[PDB]
Amino acid sequence: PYASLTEIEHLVQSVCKSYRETCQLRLEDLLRQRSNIFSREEVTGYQRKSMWEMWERCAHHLTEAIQYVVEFAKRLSGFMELCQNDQIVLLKAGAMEVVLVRMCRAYNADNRTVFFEGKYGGMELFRALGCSELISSIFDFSHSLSALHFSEDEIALYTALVLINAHRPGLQEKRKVEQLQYNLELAFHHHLCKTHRQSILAKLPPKGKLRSLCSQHVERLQIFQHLHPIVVQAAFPPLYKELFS
Amino acid sequence: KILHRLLQ
Numbered sequence A: 001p002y003a004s005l006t007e008i009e010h011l012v013q014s015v016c017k018s019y020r021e022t023c024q025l026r027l028e029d030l031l032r033q034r035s036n037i038f039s040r041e042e043v044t045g046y047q048r049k050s051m052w053e054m055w056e057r058c059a060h061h062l063t064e065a066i067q068y069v070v071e072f073a074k075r076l077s078g079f080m081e082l083c084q085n086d087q088i089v090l091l092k093a094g095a096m097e098v099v100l101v102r103m104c105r106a107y108n109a110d111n112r113t114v115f116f117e118g119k120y121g122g123m124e125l126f127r128a129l130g131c132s133e134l135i136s137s138i139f140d141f142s143h144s145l146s147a148l149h150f151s152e153d154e155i156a157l158y159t160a161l162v163l164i165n166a167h168r169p170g171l172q173e174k175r176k177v178e179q180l181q182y183n184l185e186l187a188f189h190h191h192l193c194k195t196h197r198q199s200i201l202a203k204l205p206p207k208g209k210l211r212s213l214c215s216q217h218v219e220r221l222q223i224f225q226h227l228h229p230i231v232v233q234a235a236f237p238p239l240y241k242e243l244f245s
Numbered sequence B: 001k002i003l004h005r006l007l008q
């Protein structure tokens, strides 16, 4: 339990630091690359790729993103003090949710494009995946977060809470995770109060929204795996399969 | 498998 303001502010700076250290993509880099947009020729190229090649490429890049989220957790105060069961439960449920939130940084609301393999492209880039519902949902979600003008520090505190969620089924030290979650909640809300940003509280996504996105991801994978079981077995990252089946 | 190994 964090009692003084100085303690709470120490948590804030600690969380923000752990975040900055474990982003794979610098905000500055993503912003200054925004003019670098796939041409119609390249978009057509993406649309002509097989469903299985596109899934493999997507599963690969997401897996790399997940690895940075694991590093983020390993650097988070409190997380490494939890038992290994609980560490795994939190990452299993939360890693993809954190990726989805971090993705808003790589999203340009001005033209509805996302950073993918070196350039920005709209959602039509992903048509070969055969999961437009999932894709447009992800895009709408990133759009909603972009409208809030999330700061880097807000992203750090919000993703720490996404991860440190005491309601995850299968936790052995529920009360310990609860205490960590509460301390992080005070840190997030203190920072918002300090920065006159508490108006974002009502505008943050409803809890089950992130869960809906991860469920859709799993559901689409299941269908893909049924169509291409050898591809998943032979060409999907081991970590990705472990997390998503 | 992997998450175990990544955590240590």
Ligand SMILES: COc1ccc2c(n1)CCN(C(C)=O)[C@H]2C(=O)Nc1ccc(OCc2ccccc2OC)cc1
Pocket (backbone or CB within 6 Å): A025, A055, A058, A059, A061, A062, A065, A098, A099, A100, A102, A103, A104, A106, A114, A115, A116, A117, A118, A126, A129, A138, A217
């Ligand atoms: C977390 O923050 C970010 C943001 C962007 C990127 C990264 N990290 C890592 C580096 N990167 C590269 C190298 O391209 C970017 C990326 O992966 N882009 C990207 C990948 C997949 C997308 O939708 C497909 C999809 C999404 C979710 C679930 C299943 C899916 O289909 C199977 C859309 C964009």
